[PDB]
């Protein structure tokens, strides 16, 4: 019906009957009404940009006739148009406005079809179509090259030139080089601040390229001429200018610290070594000192890239040291200033001025943080005297009051707590000693909630930075903690929260020192502690508590000897103790109490305290655990009748009540400490003996004959724990386990890949730690029932969730191991006869599922050990195995003709031990296989591009480790 074309240009609904067409029914035309469409469309769009008045207020409908034109040249060109290219050279000397919308075209066409996407052009693909379509990418070039030399109209430059930034990265680099056009750029159309802005696109984008040195540098000076002559001084005042700008400066003040930082990355060492250049050096080094001041996000973390790369260059290459130094001089400056907030600090300004506990944890934050860290770090190393100076008198200057502010005092704490690890241990001495009684005095002269606040978090805050100074010095410490134990009476529940995590961070290094009867004291530390604990958590919030008590439980565990230990966890724990017996007695006595708010939130707050110490202490908190243990099941059967109740009595929609949270939030707490003390016991034969048999009794049938909405998942993850201890010598206690939660639990989850999505992930890792340590289990299941666990195993490695699909693969390769290993016997061919080729075919199928991103390696290495399985047994049937994977390929691959079939089959097949070398066969057959038909084929590569930063990451932190001040405290053992 499309025929009615060409007429009605030589118009709304007309262009999108021929877009109809393009792409549904272009393939199917002659070669005669394919030359005739793209002809008429040609034509008909230069008319229209002949006429002024249709250029000008019409550009809306070019446009789209130009997206018409390029779905053209998608399917024609180059192999059934070879003159495209001529015919638009042809036609743009001819008219400017044609000229324009030609460039226009190149761009829109390049958009399309070429840099669709780009940097990912380092590959084999890009480069056959760069080198074989070279000569016309020549003509691009020589055409926007002709256009720029003799062009006059600025949005016809401003078209050439956006369409020469699209084709760089295509045009053979000689015409880039040998051609004036860098000249060409860096001066003229630098000079023009209507094409400012993309010129020096342009520029960064050649510093990107395949690579000439004496023109690299040549344009390098040009640029820095033309911006200190015709936009702004290296003096000038950026952060200033950028605030006070308007959207296109501020774009070319980014465009600018990108050129810069690029080009500098690349071609630093060719300033470098002709001594000739230097002041050039320094200069675009001095632009980026005043763009390192501007205060927006991706300028600065654009600034600080590039000085990381700097930096840490110049300290394992000091030679090169003094060059910078006047650069690195200021440059200390400007980050000692900017300081992005650590993790640590959990106080915080808002947008009117109040100083409040941050809601969110932005880990973009954390990226920037760790990078502006290892900045400062290795400039203190660079110069170790210059940093503390700079940090010293400033802080002065804080305490006489000129330059007291939050602010200041802030971005000054937080990049001294910064480099701890820079300095040698005395020297370091000296620097935290006259910082502390600083900071210290700062908090006796600045009064008022607020103040307050913001100094106790910068002292917290640094103190909890320097462990090795407090560990040295038993005086500073003991003063640290009796401060933070006086900021957690402060009513700010930030300062609290950061009270009791600065008190844990220094316990974790320095608990030797409370343990033990220092000179000059009456105790241990501990046992002041313990006693005023009542006083000293008064105001905390019950989380906070639970901290302070976990802050002691690890001190307590420094005592070696069983007696004292005890007495001090005994004592430790009076206070929930008390709580804990009182509260048996009253529930068990009222049941209904239960149905109590506050009731309810004692219990499982006393759970909570047991859980945080037992987190703690480890295997030595058993005395406690065994104290509350037979009560506590006791009080968890009794919340499960509770519960029951509610549901039976209300409906399904009880569990959504708070009286049911309520009494979950005990149920789980309970798994919780179990599972908690389960992990770390040493006493593993007690743990079976005493422990396991009335934790399964309480907690599995419960679980079993509840309504799905109130089956805690907490469950699976404390039997995780306990099968992954002792589940090899509890054989019946794991047959209980699987029996109460493996058929329920598959129920919930088999229908959807996402309703109960932390029953899913923690039953999955159940099965794991079963089908691992008591295998024995899967066969005292009814044959329904392990027919059951390989369904489930499969719907598993279907799931997109790594959390769930990685034990899938898991437990698929350690049932197939254990089948490989028992040889000939009857369960394992009933596992060829009724399993073996479901795994076959549903691994090949996840695996070659191109909207399935995840887990190639690990599928490809489970279809390896599946095709051994049977060609490594002589007596299999092996013909067979082929047959079937004959039809499943022709079945997913409907497309291939016989042959090729037959290729891949026998490639998949001739060897199935060495798993890099079947990877790669399977990649290459489903790369070329993917290819005819478009599918996506970077998920077969992103295992190992993940591994290989993985690796590059744990080698960056080993190099890390050597330099003091890199890791910070918390990160070593410790």
Known sequence: AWQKADQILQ??????????????????????????????????????CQDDEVFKTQKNLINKSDLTLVQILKQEWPQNWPEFIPELIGSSSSSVNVCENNMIVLKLLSEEVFDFSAEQMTQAKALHLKNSMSKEFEQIFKLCFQVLEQGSSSSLIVATLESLLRYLHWIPYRYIYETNILELLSTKFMTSPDTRAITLKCLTEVSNLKIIKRQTVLFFQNTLQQIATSVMPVTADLKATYANANGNDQSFLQDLAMFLTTYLARNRALLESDESLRELLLNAHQYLIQLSKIEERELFKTTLDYWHNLVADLFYEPLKKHIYEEICSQLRLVIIENMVRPEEVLVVENDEGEIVREFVKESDTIQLYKSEREVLVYLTHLNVIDTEEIMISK?????????????????????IGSISGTMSEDTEKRFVVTVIKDLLDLTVKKRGKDNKAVVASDIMYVVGQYPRFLKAHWNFLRTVILKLFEFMHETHEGVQDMACDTFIKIVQKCKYHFVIQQPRESEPFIQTIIRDIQKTTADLQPQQVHTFYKACGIIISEERSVAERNRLLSDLMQLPNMAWDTIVEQSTANPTLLLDSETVKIIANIIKTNVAVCTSMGADFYPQLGHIYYNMLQLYRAVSSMISAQVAAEGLIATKTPKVRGLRTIKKEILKLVETYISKARNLDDVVKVLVEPLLNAVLEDYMNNVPDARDAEVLNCMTTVVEKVGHMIPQGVILILQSVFECTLDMINKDFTEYPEHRVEFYKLLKVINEKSFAAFLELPPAAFKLFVDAICWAFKHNNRDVEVNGLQIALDLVKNIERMGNVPFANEFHKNYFFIFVSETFFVL?????????????????????????????NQVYLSQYLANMLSNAFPHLTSEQIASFLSALTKQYKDLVVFKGTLRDFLVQIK????????????????????????????????????????????
């Open 395 to 415: 802080l002065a200057r804080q305490i006489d009051g000129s330059e007291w502010s939050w602010h200041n005092i802030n971005t000054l704490s937080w990049a």
């Open 11 to 48: 118009k709304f609904i007309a262009l999108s009957i021929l877009d109809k067409l393009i792409t549904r029914k272009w393939k199917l035309l002659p070669n005669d009404h394919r030359i005739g469409i793209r002809n008429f469309v040609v034509g008909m769009i230069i008319s229209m």
């Open 848 to 876: 070659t599922d191109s909207d399935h991103k995840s887990g190639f390696s690990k599928q490809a290495l489970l279809l390896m050990k599946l095709i051994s399985l049977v060609y490594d047994n002589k007596t299999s």
């Open 931 to 974: 290819e005819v038909g478009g599918d996506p084929t970077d998920y077969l590569f992103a295992e190992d591009k993940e591994n290989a930063l993985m690796e590059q990451n744990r080698l960056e932190r080993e190099k890390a480790a050597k330099i003091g001040g890199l890791l910070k405290p918390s990160e070593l053992d410790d």
